[PDB]
Amino acid sequence: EGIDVKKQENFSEWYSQVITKSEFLDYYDVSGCYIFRPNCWFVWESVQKFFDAEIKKLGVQNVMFPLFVTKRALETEEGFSPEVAWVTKSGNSDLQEPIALRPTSETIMYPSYAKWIQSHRDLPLKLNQWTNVVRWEFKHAVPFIRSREFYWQEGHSAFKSKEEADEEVFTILELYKRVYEELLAVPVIKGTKTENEKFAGADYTTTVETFIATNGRAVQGGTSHHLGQNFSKMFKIQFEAENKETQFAYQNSWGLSTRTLGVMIMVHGDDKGMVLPPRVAFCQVVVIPLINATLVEKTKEIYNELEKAGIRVKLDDRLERTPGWKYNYWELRGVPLRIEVGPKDLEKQQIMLCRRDTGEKWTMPLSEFSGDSIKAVLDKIHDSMLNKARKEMNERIVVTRTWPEFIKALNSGNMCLIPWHESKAAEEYIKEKSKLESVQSQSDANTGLTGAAKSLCVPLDQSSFPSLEGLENFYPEEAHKKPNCWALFGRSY
Amino acid sequence: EGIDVKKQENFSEWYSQVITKSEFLDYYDVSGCYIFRPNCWFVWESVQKFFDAEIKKLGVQNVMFPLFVTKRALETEKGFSPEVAWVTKSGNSDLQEPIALRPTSETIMYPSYAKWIQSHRDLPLKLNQWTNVVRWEFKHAVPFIRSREFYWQEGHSAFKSKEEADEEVFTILELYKRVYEELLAVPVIKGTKTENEKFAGADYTTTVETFIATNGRAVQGGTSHHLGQNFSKMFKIQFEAENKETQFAYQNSWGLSTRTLGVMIMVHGDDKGMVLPPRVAFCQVVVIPLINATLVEKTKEIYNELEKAGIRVKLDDRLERTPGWKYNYWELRGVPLRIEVGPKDLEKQQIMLCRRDTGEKWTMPLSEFSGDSIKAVLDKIHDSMLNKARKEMNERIVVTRTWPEFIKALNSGNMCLIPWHESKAAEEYIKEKSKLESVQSQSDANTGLTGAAKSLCVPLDQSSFPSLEGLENFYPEEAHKKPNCWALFGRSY
Ligand SMILES: Nc1ncnc2c1ncn2[C@@H]1O[C@H](COP(=O)(O)OP(=O)(O)NP(=O)(O)O)[C@@H](O)[C@H]1O
Numbered sequence: 001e002g003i004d005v006k007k008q009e010n011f012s013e014w015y016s017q018v019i020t021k022s023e024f025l026d027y028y029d030v031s032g033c034y035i036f037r038p039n040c041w042f043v044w045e046s047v048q049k050f051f052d053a054e055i056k057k058l059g060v061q062n063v064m065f066p067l068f069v070t071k072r073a074l075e076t077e078e079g080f081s082p083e084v085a086w087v088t089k090s091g092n093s094d095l096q097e098p099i100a101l102r103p104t105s106e107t108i109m110y111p112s113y114a115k116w117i118q119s120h121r122d123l124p125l126k127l128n129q130w131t132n133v134v135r136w137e138f139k140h141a142v143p144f145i146r147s148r149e150f151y152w153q154e155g156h157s158a159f160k161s162k163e164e165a166d167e168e169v170f171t172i173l174e175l176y177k178r179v180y181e182e183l184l185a186v187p188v189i190k191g192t193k194t195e196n197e198k199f200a201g202a203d204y205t206t207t208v209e210t211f212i213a214t215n216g217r218a219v220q221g222g223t224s225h226h227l228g229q230n231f232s233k234m235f236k237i238q239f240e241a242e243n244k245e246t247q248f249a250y251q252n253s254w255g256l257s258t259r260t261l262g263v264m265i266m267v268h269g270d271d272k273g274m275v276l277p278p279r280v281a282f283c284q285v286v287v288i289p290l291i292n293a294t295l296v297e298k299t300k301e302i303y304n305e306l307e308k309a310g311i312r313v314k315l316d317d318r319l320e321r322t323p324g325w326k327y328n329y330w331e332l333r334g335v336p337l338r339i340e341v342g343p344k345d346l347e348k349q350q351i352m353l354c355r356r357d358t359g360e361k362w363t364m365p366l367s368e369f370s371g372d373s374i375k376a377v378l379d380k381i382h383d384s385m386l387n388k389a390r391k392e393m394n395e396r397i398v399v400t401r402t403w404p405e406f407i408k409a410l411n412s413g414n415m416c417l418i419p420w421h422e423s424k425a426a427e428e429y430i431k432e433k434s435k436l437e438s439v440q441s442q443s444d445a446n447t448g449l450t451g452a453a454k455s456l457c458v459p460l461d462q463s464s465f466p467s468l469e470g471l472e473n474f475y476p477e478e479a480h481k482k483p484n485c486w487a488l489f490g491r492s493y
Numbered sequence: 494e495g496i497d498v499k500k501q502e503n504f505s506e507w508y509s510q511v512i513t514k515s516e517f518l519d520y521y522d523v524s525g526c527y528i529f530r531p532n533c534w535f536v537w538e539s540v541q542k543f544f545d546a547e548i549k550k551l552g553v554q555n556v557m558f559p560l561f562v563t564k565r566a567l568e569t570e571k572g573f574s575p576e577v578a579w580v581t582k583s584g585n586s587d588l589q590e591p592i593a594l595r596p597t598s599e600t601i602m603y604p605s606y607a608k609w610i611q612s613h614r615d616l617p618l619k620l621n622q623w624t625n626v627v628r629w630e631f632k633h634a635v636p637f638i639r640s641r642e643f644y645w646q647e648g649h650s651a652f653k654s655k656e657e658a659d660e661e662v663f664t665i666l667e668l669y670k671r672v673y674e675e676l677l678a679v680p681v682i683k684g685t686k687t688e689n690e691k692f693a694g695a696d697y698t699t700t701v702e703t704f705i706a707t708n709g710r711a712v713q714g715g716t717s718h719h720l721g722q723n724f725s726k727m728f729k730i731q732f733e734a735e736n737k738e739t740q741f742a743y744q745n746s747w748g749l750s751t752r753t754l755g756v757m758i759m760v761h762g763d764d765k766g767m768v769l770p771p772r773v774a775f776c777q778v779v780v781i782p783l784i785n786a787t788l789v790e791k792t793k794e795i796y797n798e799l800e801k802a803g804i805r806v807k808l809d810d811r812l813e814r815t816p817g818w819k820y821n822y823w824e825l826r827g828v829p830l831r832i833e834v835g836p837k838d839l840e841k842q843q844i845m846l847c848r849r850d851t852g853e854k855w856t857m858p859l860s861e862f863s864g865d866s867i868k869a870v871l872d873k874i875h876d877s878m879l880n881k882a883r884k885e886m887n888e889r890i891v892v893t894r895t896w897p898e899f900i901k902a903l904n905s906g907n908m909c910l911i912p913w914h915e916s917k918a919a920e921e922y923i924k925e926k927s928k929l930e931s932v933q934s935q936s937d938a939n940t941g942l943t944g945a946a947k948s949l950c951v952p953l954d955q956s957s958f959p960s961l962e963g964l965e966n967f968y969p970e971e972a973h974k975k976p977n978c979w980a981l982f983g984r985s986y
Pocket residue numbers: 104135137144145146147148149150152220221222223255256257258259493
């Protein structure tokens with residue numbers, strides 16, 4: 001019926017109410033696993049359709065490798081071993097050989113890559129799969145953001161040269177930016193991860209960072225690695241080059257998950273419920289006749305013209321429901337645009353429009369109604385949602401040249417740009433010190449989160465940042481390691 | 494290389510060579526699990542695209558429920574226990590209780606159906622999901638046909654009346670017939686399973702049966718159940734009806750798996766390799782210029798015409814390879830149509846065509862060449878493939894009124910239409926009597942198959958069948974129970 005807790009009052013309770021009452025998600029009796037209902041799964045299918053079409057242009061092909069992986073394969077690569085789920089029984093009998101569930105597919109796929117790649121004519125090899133993933137997360141589960149079963153695509157490419165591989169890393173990273181910005185209306189920051197946060201198997205890791213303004217937390221939104229020759233040496237992925245010598249392939253891997261849906265909801269949801277970006281909305285426009293014979297047919301005509309134009313449109317002519325009840329029903333579920341067709345408005349040859357993101361109501365003359373004009377309204381809603389979130393995000397990025405500035409901005413829910421010289425020890429120092437001086441909400445503490453700051457990324461584009469002249473390393477033991485770039489640090493999920 | 498064992502010489506070795514050398518499938522180090530390579534996964538994606546579009550017209554919506562099910566939930570349904578795969582630990586730590594991997598999702602989904610359905614206004618509820626499934630099969634694994642991990646869609650619907658549910662069962666069954674015939678060029682027989690073979694939770698089970706002529710075996714191709722109120726009583730799926738009574742919902746479920754791909758290959762594959770039905774072929778047409786600047790330009794124009802028409806076309810202009818080498822390359826991989834462009838052909842303003850299913854070669858004048866005319870050729874190939882398979886299947890259905898006729902037809906690789914009076918004891922009698930008198934190939938024996946006759950289905954359409962007057966029950970202990978329909982029996986996978 002309604003959200004009874006405000007987003008600003010208790011973020012975790014608000015989130016639970018919005019994802020369930022919108023019919024997006026239900027809870028389940030295996031901890032950390034969730035049910036994706038139709039309006040929710042539609043968003044992920046929309047991401048799939050867009051991403052598939054974009055990677056097809058790059059020559060990537062979809063495959064399906066198995067869910068199961070042997071201990072022998074997995075151990076070809078300690079740190080992650082507590083998160084692996086093990087199948088050990090069939091029926092009532094122990095298996096002679098326990099097997100694990102897919103936590104990622106490097107060790108499942110790369111023995112095949114070593115078989116399939118024999119010469120440079122076999123390269124590039126670029127494969128993708130849309131799969132479920134299992135990780136027995138130690139951290140508290142969070143619907144969409146951190147689930148023990150989640151859904152993703154993982155792409156794995158092999159190249160004859162580093163230049164080709166480098167180019168794909170940033171091409172895929174741009175596609176992840178386009179998913180967030182063009183489909184989900186969520187702004188991103190591109191950067192590289194620090195040595196402590198990057199994939200241990202990667203030469204370097206790139207990320208799109210996203211930001212949750214309500215509790216001032218970043219979310220790692222998607223990942224694109226250059227693996228160098230680290231895995232090709234591990235798995236003997238070699239080829240005869242055109243120069244007749246044998247070389248190790250250069251590889252990348254990259255993944256994007258249903259975490260996207262959680263970011264979308266946390267960024268755009270409000271105290272009336274879901275707010276769906278038009279390009280992933282299960283229903284983009286709901287038409288509601290206010291209740292007469294002629295009004296019904298014009299309402300049917302409005303429905304049919306939008307449907308013919310490819311707009312996902314619904315006609316809510318339910319009899320036993322008041323107009324206001326219908327308004328709440330579809331606002332709760334996130335429909336971006338409502339058309340109200342009333343008798344008074346029909347007399348003036350017009351209709352009433354209400355946009356979900358701002359609540360604004362305005363009239364449109366029927367002479368200006370069309371599939372194109374309604375699509376233009378939907379694009380305006382998309383642009384406003386993205387622009388509002390980007391303005392909020394940018395206002396919450398603070399340049400913090402010194403520790404007192406850093407901890408102050410962190411405690412007020414900002415992301416911080418700090419002078420940086422790469423060092424695992426410096427990053428650990430910052431994490432421990434900020435954690436000791438941090439404060440966080442009871443809701444965040446209940447969600448298993450910490451007030452500690454961690455590295456989010458080193459932004460790719462440093463051109464707008466101020467001078468590093470005279471700035472000191474945040475880690476006093478490494479004052480002799482002069483800062484030479486800016487890093488983004490903040491609280492995180 | 495190429496296929497070096499004939500389909501009629503050693504069926505299981507032929508099958509292994511065709512699925513691997515065509516780049517459809519690779520073997521893997523977990524028993525009963527296989528790698529689906531791009532050209533193979535394309536077939537399943539094509540089935541998904543078609544089936545999704547058709548069930549959308551019915552109001553069915555896609556969802557995703559979890560991979561895991563609790564022990565308590567799994568035992569609510571009231572045999573299969575040895576096939577259940579159990580996760581018992583994460584890393585080194587035992588779980589509090591083991592959790593099972595999805596063998597099917599009745600016990601995962603129906604507790605939610607009971608929560609979600611409360612009024613007749615909540616019905617019908619029609620959900621579908623495209624998922625992986627795990628069953629610890631005791632029978633010998635067979636690529637595609639019987640794998641320990643497999644992929645399917647499962648649909649689960651709830652209705653306020655039996656009439657609505659009945660209609661859906663046969664609507665879905667017709668869609669499965671269309672998948673096999675219109676996409677895969679595989680003929681089917683629709684029928685109802687006997688009491689011994691139907692799903693224990695179902696009031697009745699329908700099936701599309703398919704036939705592998707090489708070893709005279711049926712394959713159950715897809716399943717559509719009417720569950721009645723059996724599960725809604727089990728899970729308390731109830732609704733307030735229009736008359737204010739509380740009533741149990743009527744339910745169906747239905748599933749179709751990647752077994753489809755195995756049937757397609759076993760039916761159409763030949764001694765040169767894969768033979769792809771055009772509507773699921775990763776590449777429908779390969780254009781090969783015979784080597785010259787004019788020929789190169791005309792060949793590119795031929796390619797461009799087909800690409801613009803939406804035909805999946807490749808241009809194989811590889812330089813140092815004989816025509817016959819390229820021909821073998823694409824024949825092995827199953828491409829249904831080859832276009833050869835040589836200077837002598839262009840001097841007669843014609844191109845040379847060669848169809849994969851029959852090997853026929855013929856010329857087409859350039860003035861008759863277009864996207865539409867090539868599509869018509871591809872449709873002709875589809876029709877021929879389906880018609881050939883149907884003719885063979887019908888020739889291998891034998892009306893067997895007496896036991897000597899039955900065992901003769903069975904041992905010669907036919908399906909048998911027998912006078913039938915439903916009885917589990919009669920079905921078991923026929924199974925054990927036929928097993929004792931049966932013969933089968935060494936390849937079938939090595940595949941873990943048997944010569945026993947299984948009930949396949951009672952065909953829905955009995956109108957073309959002979960008179961039952963004066964026919965005798967095959968089971969002498971029930972001689973007083975006169976045959977009242979015809980049943981299809983045969984060897985099976
Ligand atoms: N448990 C999870 N649930 C949902 N999405 C996830 C989960 N773990 C990771 N992802 C997402 O999947 C992407 C690729 O996964 P990966 O690089 O393995 O993540 P990661 O290093 O484990 N990150 P994290 O655990 O969030 O600190 C990440 O960038 C996340 O956006």
